[PDB]
Design a protein around this ligand. Structure first.
Ligand SMILES: Nc1ncnc2c1ncn2[C@@H]1O[C@H](COP(=O)(O)OP(=O)(O)O)[C@@H](O)[C@H]1O
Lengths: 197, 144, 72, 72
């Protein structure tokens, strides 16, 4: 055939700061979104690209809210809401999944961008962020885990309240992928960053 | 723009220039919603409408003179423009189909590098065109 | 049917420390509007989210003034 | 304008002028695509129409009295 259809495994995914390999849901087979964010010193203006629906803007605002609450836990700038702009790029427009496509993914991506600390690969994370830092359970985790296995990633952290879904899916999928239970975005902050802080 | 003409003579494509200075609105570079008679797209879209080929030589004019008084920067749309594979994700408001600006070879112009919008500061190669001497000006006068 | 799709008889709901539960009405029947409020330190402005009109803003500001007259 | 008239007389071609000032849109110069009765081109086409020669001396009046807010 010639050129491979997709980029080589673990080649398109490298440990970087602005990248965010977040699981996504699509009607004709799940995929994974490489979310990119640009955070270098500015004035606090928010930017979105990719024919996005507005719901991602509130998800980003919730992410900024959470960062403004636990800023000093990881060395983030003391007064950054008035000194740094955020420019987020999403490879697709929006997902049919109502609410944010992946809230904790964007929150951790923006936290990494502000901290300028590379995000770990070999882990794909999806879930909806809340202003109180609570990872609300997400539906349709089946295709999420299927695409994650197709992504070559075995470590997939999921919302804590989705733990019951870890008993309804077939064992052919659950056992092949490592799963952690999380409820606070601060928990996955240490699990999607190269350094502990 | 003479360098643009020379480049388009080399590639034998069609050359064009569009002004970008004095732009204060994102809706000036992006399109407008279908909310009035004769809703208009962005400047780049209509400039493409001027051309008839999807791989011309196109030139920007003072990209460093962007402006926006509300959230978001014009550098975001221009960054979408930067990557030819991301060009297929073109922002639009009159049309909704992202155009394929991948084959549209973009060459840029900014009289001041430090006023270029800092989201567009990555992936810039400052080809600093220098000033000209008395003898150099004499020569280019006697020749061009 | 599998796992309970919905939360059990509400004696212990999700951890609620910054948010409050709320009754409301919709064309599709009543719901539970657990309104989430985040108190981020800043420049003392109101930043509503959830595509809310200014009527929601004036309700919020009425609450704000009520606490501003009952601070201590 | 009288200078323009003198110039046109010297060139012996019929003078004309059009008050292009006070035009607030691109539509009054390009018209619009004809799709109804009362489909009208721009001012320049009017000027060339009422001057029945292909080489007039048109005076763009008040060219610095335009505005650009809508319709191009
Ligand atoms: N060494 C030179 N440096 C700059 N300009 C030159 C030189 N030699 C000749 N020229 C002439 O100077 C002109 C510059 O015009 P233009 O391209 O409109 O300037 P700009 O693109 O900076 O607005 C060109 O038409 C070109 O023919």
């Amino acid at each position: 055939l010639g050129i491979p259809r997709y980029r080589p495994d673990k080649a398109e995914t490298e440990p970087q700061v602005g990248t965010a390999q977040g699981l996504a849901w699509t009607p004709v087979g799940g995929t994974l979104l490489t979310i990119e964010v640009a955070a270098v010193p500015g004035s606090g203006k928010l930017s979105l690209t990719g024919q996005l629906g507005e719901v991602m803007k509130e998800s980003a605002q919730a992410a900024l809210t959470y960062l403004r609450a636990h800023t000093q836990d990881y060395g983030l700038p003391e007064d950054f809401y008035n000194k740094v702009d955020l420019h987020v790029h999403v490879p697709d427009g929006a997902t049919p999944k109502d609410g944010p496509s992946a809230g904790i993914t964007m929150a951790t991506a923006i936290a990494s961008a502000l901290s300028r600390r590379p995000a770990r690969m070999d882990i794909a994370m999806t879930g909806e962020v809340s202003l109180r830092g609570k990872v609300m359970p997400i539906g349709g985790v089946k295709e999420k885990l299927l695409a994650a296995h197709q992504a070559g990633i075995h470590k997939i952290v999921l919302p804590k309240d989705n733990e019951a879904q870890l008993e309804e899916l077939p064992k052919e999928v659950l056992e092949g992928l490592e799963i952690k239970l999380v409820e606070d975005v601060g928990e996955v902050l240490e699990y999607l960053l190269l350094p502990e802080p | 723009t003479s360098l643009g003409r020379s480049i388009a003579r080399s590639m034998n494509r069609k050359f064009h220039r569009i002004s970008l200075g004095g732009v204060r609105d994102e809706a000036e570079i992006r399109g407008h919603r279908r909310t009035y008679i004769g809703a208009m797209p962005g400047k780049l879209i209509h400039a493409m409408k001027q051309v008839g080929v999807i791989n011309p030589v196109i030139l920007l004019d003072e990209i460093d003179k962007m402006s926006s008084d509300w959230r978001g920067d014009p550098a975001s749309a221009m960054l979408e423009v930067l990557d030819p594979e991301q060009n297929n994700t073109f922002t639009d408001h009159y049309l909704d189909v992202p155009y394929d600006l991948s084959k549209v070879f973009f060459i840029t112009t900014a009289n001041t590098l430090q006023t270029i919008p800092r989201p567009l500061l990555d992936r810039m190669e400052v080809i600093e065109i220098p000033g000209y001497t008395n003898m150099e000006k004499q020569a280019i006068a006697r020749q061009y």
